[PDB]
Protein: YTH domain-containing protein 1
Organism: Homo sapiens
Amino acid sequence: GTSKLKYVLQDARFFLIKSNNHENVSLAKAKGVWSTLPVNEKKLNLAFRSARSVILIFSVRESGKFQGFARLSSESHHGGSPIHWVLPAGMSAKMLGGVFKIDWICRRELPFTKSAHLTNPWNEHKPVKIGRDGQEIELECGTQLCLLFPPDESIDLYQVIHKM
Ligand SMILES: CNc1nc(Cl)nc2c1ncn2Cc1cccc(C(N)=O)c1
């Protein structure tokens, strides 16, 4: 069902994550980690303390889709085997230092064509697919967007609710 999902999304904050390549999103799904640029890293650390759930909604650039969504389980931390991110033109690897742990809520795709009726007040009411990496999505639009994804029956939200 969707009752536990709605509970997790209750009073959550939502952020759009734009990745330049599929390889890093695949790595994030396999390992439960994400790294972003320092400007967005600071925003996510502040949000993590402020909200019962912080949700990252992922979209690979030029894919025309979202690839899933996940909940932050930690603030960013440095120190660990450098994740073997595929670095775009000038990512320095030092800018992708700072690793957040995430718990996937949905690893299924959603095409942008399915979200065309959702606009984001925090980005001038443009369609929610439009936005830069780290753009915050207002609560009602973010909740609706997450509910549009196909159910991911491989995920049990029971352990996620306990992190809360
Ligand atoms: C593992 N984390 C990531 N992996 C990849 Cl492949 N792309 C990411 C990313 N995080 C943000 N992006 C998008 C991006 C790429 C280069 C420059 C900017 C800029 N704002 O100038 C933004």
Observations:
- Residues 65 and 111 are 4 Å apart (CA to CA).
- The pocket of IYQ is lined by residues 18-21, 24, 35-37, 85-86, 88, 91, 96, 133 (CB under 6 Å).
- Helices lie at 3-9, 22-31, 38-50, 139-148, 158-163.
